Design a protein around this ligand. Structure first.
Ligand SMILES: CCN1CCN(Cc2ccc(-c3cc4c(N[C@H](C)c5ccccc5)ncnc4[nH]3)cc2)CC1
Length: 306
């Protein structure tokens, strides 16, 4: 189809100063850090991710696939790649989402997260995903853990290690084995390994459930082998306490067997927008940096021709 004219930026290692670990994942460490472009005279907070440590040609392939996808997106609700650095090991460098991921965030702040935020974030994720849909791009790993907090009023979708572009105007993506987050997967993704924009919807349904239960674990207790069945019998996640039937009703729809019966991300945006206009009618909740930051700027503010 259309030619992908994204500009992958190569970055010198002298161009940015690492400052601390944020996630020494088994798969690879992720750092906080600063980037000071060529001679631009601006510093930009960034997250830096290198494939664990050792360079195994096998691993290198995937980190770059992420770099590829992440460099091909440009929307206020999706995390974009700033560029890569080809030192001994490959690094992905992107804008810093200071507050970490949304999951941890709700857990850490239950007693202060109001309805306005919950629905507002539900809107922002619906937007990000709708963007990816437009870019014919299936995420395959939508979850609360993979949404990052820029500010409490601004979340963006990240982690494209499993995304997939759709070519030859094909609809359902057939994939391999490996490690897949079952609890967030659509039924088709579990039985036929079929993935699609509409299976992303399902994962969205579970993501919205996460945020509404303040960070609970889906099907907690249960074990993934067990899952496919259950879901098969007809069982779905329960209605979260703070949830009106209206909201839970939208969650259930992202979980219907007939994948074309679920809502499109563009409808989910509309529906949540309405609700966000009167957040108290839809959610019932009890009670509703160490530098010459003189030249510090934020990615979303640093742009280059395009
Ligand atoms: C009380 C909560 N506690 C302390 C605050 N945070 C720490 C934290 C802060 C930022 C981040 C963070 C991760 C991250 C991030 N991770 C993704 C996987 C990424 C992908 C490619 C390149 C860089 C990052 N990307 C961009 N910005 C990010 N910021 C992670 C953890 C959560 C744990």
């Amino acid at each position: 189809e259309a030619p992908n004219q994204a500009l992958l930026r190569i970055l010198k290692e002298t161009e940015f100063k690492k400052i601390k670990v944020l996630g020494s994942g088994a798969f690879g460490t992720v750092y906080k850090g600063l980037w000071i472009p060529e001679g631009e005279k601006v510093k930009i907070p960034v997250a830096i991710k290198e494939l664990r440590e050792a360079t195994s040609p096998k691993a290198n392939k995937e980190i770059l696939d992420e770099a590829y996808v992440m460099a091909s997106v440009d929307n206020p609700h999706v995390c974009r790649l700033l560029g890569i650095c080809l030192t001994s090991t490959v690094q992905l460098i992107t804008q810093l989402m200071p507050f970490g991921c949304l999951l941890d965030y709700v857990r850490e702040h239950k007693d202060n997260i109001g309805s306005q935020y919950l629905l507002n974030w539900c809107v922002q994720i619906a937007k990000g995903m709708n963007y990816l849909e437009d870019r014919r791009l299936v995420h395959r790993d939508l979850a609360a853990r993979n949404v990052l907090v820029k500010t409490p009023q601004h979340v963006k979708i990240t982690d494209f290690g499993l995304a997939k572009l759709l070519g030859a105007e094909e609809k359902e993506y057939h994939a391999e084995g490996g490690k897949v987050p079952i609890k967030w997967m659509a039924l088709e993704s579990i039985l036929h390994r079929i993935y699609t924009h509409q299976s992303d919807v399902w994962s969205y349904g579970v993501t919205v459930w996460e945020l509404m239960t303040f960070g609970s674990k889906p099907y907690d207790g249960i074990p993934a082998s067990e899952i496919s069945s259950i879901l098969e019998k007809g069982e779905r996640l329960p209605q979260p306490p703070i949830c009106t039937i209206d909201v839970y009703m939208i969650m259930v729809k992202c979980w219907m067997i007939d994948a074309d019966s679920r809502p499109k991300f563009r409808e989910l945006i509309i529906e949540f927008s309405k609700m966000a206009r009167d957040p108290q009618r839809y959610l019932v909740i009890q009670g509703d940096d160490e530098e010459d930051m003189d030249d510090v700027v934020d990615a979303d503010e640093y742009l280059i021709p395009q």
